[PDB]
């Protein structure tokens, strides 16, 4: 039912963080100024950082869902889940062990994000166009989304992250 937040968007996918917030990969989104979800610019604002694109609608587009916590990446070693969807409607929860930050070239830009190692169990990975799918993990009792899928390397993936932490500190 968290899978219902992951929806086809542009040439990739997107995720509903809340009823007002929709995040996706910048490199798969429709052109700047395109009417989406029956909403035109003015009904929503747009912010971005690297390949992370964030839509905020003044009116709720998804009433059925509560706000999920969005955080700028996560601790290294934490096993997250990339919620991958396909055109056929197939759902693939890929376990990814998040690691260090790195840079990569997607289109005409060099973008940054937190890398991750795809975990093979004992029983394929991502394709281009899985881009925009969310990286989620459970924080004790609470679900947290930490970023959107950017790309896979030539078992390493990388997710675009976003957000200014609530806590601020110090001036060395």
Numbering used by the authors: 4 to 126, 132 to 162, 165 to 182
Give the original sentences from the paper that presented this experimental model.
To investigate the structural variation in substrate recognition we also made an NS6 chimera which interchanged the residues P4-P4′ of the NS6-7 cleavage junction with the sequence of the NS2-3 junction from MNV (NS6 4′ 2|3). NS6 4′ 2|3 crystallised with two molecules in a P1 unit cell. The modelled monomers start at residue 4 and end at residue 182; in contrast to the other structures reported here, the A chain lack density for the tip of the eII-fII loop so residues 162–163 were omitted. The A and B chains each extend their C-termini into the cleft formed between the bII-cII and eII-fII loops of a neighbouring molecule. The packing arrangements are distinct but rather similar and, once again, lack specific contacts that are consistent with productive substrate binding.
Whereas ORF2, ORF3 and ORF4 each encode single proteins, ORF1 codes for a large polyprotein (∼190 kDa) that is processed by the virally-encoded protease at five specific sites to release the six ‘mature’ non-structural proteins (NS1/2–NS7)—and an array of functional precursors—that are required for virus replication. The viral NS6 protease present within the C-terminal half of the polyprotein performs all the processing, including its own autocatalytic release from the precursor. Norovirus NS6 is a cysteine protease with a chymotrypsin-like fold: two β-barrel domains separated by a cleft that contains a Cys-His-Asp/Glu catalytic triad similar in arrangement to the Ser-His-Asp triad characteristic of serine proteases. To this end we extended an inactive MNV NS6 construct (which incorporates a C139A mutation to knock out the active site nucleophile) by adding residues from NS7, which is immediately downstream in the polyprotein.
